């Protein structure tokens, strides 16, 4: 019913910016079936196998000087450089969250809802507060969800039972807005 | 614009 | 550290597929249409502020080609073991009578990058204006792939994503409906 084995190889080359691009670091990994075999770490500056089925590669590619040069080098002239390529709508990206409130039951309301939508990049601080003290305990959320179109989500649920005459407010931070946005749901 | 540059695979040990 | 970016292809037998991609912090960058030859940008504003050679990436796909058989022969000709995603359905964001929405059907976690997908509305596949991703890879080299259905939600419609893949008993229906 197709069932003939399959034989996959992935490669990785990683670039990894500490600190926009004061200290990069490269990772080229060789993967048969899911397993990593052979390695280059700009770290090292060398081919090292990660497994005995990549001992031939690393000791044949650490014989080519000129491939050898190249990678070294590479942290110069292809992380460095694609870094700055894309910097501009990559790492500087901004885009302000929707947040909407709303009511719930639980698997005469028990649940109040804070959506909040399409913002990039990923990290956020969403919190609830009941007049002006923040509510910790009772918050479970989806946690952070990301799209895979450049934007994310969450849903940060709060267990209450609303009494009326109290004002809950759920309150965002995001790198997108220079305040904190508040959406409020009363009595 | 700027090129986006890419690392060129090379090729293993056969036998 | 503050980002990553990787540049990950793949190249798949017996099937003779493979993909070349750009990753940065899990979005997809760009990748190559190895049927049409040509560089295709995740967003449009991308492909008018950068440009990639995508000539490049076919020399590396050949190249990975040759690799793969060497390293089957080396393996003693052993496969890879399936391993079977997880699958959620997701709206893009909260829905509201009348305006249009996105489902998302992700699936995670899952090897090796083979996998069907079927929309259905109300029972019936339906395939108006669906799209999806590139397999996206993951720290521990399984995949990651979404897939997209626009829809204008209604009371009356229910929705489900059916996933195959080769490390699944019978295949993954994942259902959603509006509440």
């Given at each position: 019913?197709?069932?003939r ?6 490669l ?21 079936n ?13 081919y ?18 000129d491939l ?23 790492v ?60 994310f ?35 | ?15 | ?20 991609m ?51 022969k ?11 995603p ?24 899952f090897?090796?990058?083979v ?23 993951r ?29 699944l ?11």
């Amino acid at each position: 019913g197709d069932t003939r084995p399959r034989f996959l190889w992935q490669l990785k080359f990683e670039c990894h910016f500490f600190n926009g691009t004061e200290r990069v670091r490269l990772l080229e990994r060789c993967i048969y079936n899911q397993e990593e075999s052979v390695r280059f770490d700009s770290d090292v500056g060398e081919y090292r196998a990660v497994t005995e089925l990549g001992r031939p590669d690393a000791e044949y590619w650490n014989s080519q000087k000129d491939l050898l040069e190249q990678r070294r080098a590479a942290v110069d002239t292809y992380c460095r450089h694609n870094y700055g390529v894309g910097e501009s709508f990559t790492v500087q990206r901004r885009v302000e969250p929707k947040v909407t409130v709303y009511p719930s039951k639980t698997q005469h309301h028990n649940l109040l809802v804070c959506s909040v939508s399409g913002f990039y990049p990923g990290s956020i601080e969403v919190r609830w507060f009941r007049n002006g003290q923040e509510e910790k305990a009772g918050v479970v959320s989806t946690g952070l969800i990301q799209n895979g179109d450049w934007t994310f989500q969450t849903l940060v649920m709060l267990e209450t039972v609303p009494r009326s005459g109290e004002v809950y407010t759920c309150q965002v931070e995001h790198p997108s807005v220079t305040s904190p946005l508040t959406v409020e749901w009363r009595a | 614009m700027g090129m986006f540059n890419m690392l060129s695979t090379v090729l293993g040990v056969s036998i | 550290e503050e980002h990553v970016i990787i540049q990950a292809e793949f190249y798949l037998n017996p099937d003779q597929s493979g993909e070349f991609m750009f990753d940065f912090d899990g979005d997809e960058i760009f990748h190559v249409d190895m049927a049409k030859k040509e560089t295709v940008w995740r967003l449009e504003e991308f492909g008018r502020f950068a440009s990639f050679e995508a000539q490049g990436a076919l020399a590396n796909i050949a190249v990975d080609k040759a690799n793969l058989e060497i390293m089957t022969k080396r393996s003693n000709y052993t496969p890879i073991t399936n391993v079977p995603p997880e699958v959620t359905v997701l709206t893009n964001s909260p829905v509201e009578l009348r305006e249009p929405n996105v489902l998302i059907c992700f699936i995670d976690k899952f090897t090796p990058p083979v996998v069907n997908v079927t929309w259905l509305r109300n029972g019936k596949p339906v395939t108006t204006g669906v799209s999806e991703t590139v397999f996206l890879p993951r720290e521990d080299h399984l995949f990651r792939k979404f897939h997209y259905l626009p829809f204008l939600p209604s009371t009356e419609d229910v929705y489900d994503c059916r996933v195959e893949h080769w490390g699944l008993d019978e295949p993954l229906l994942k259902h959603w409906e509006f509440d």
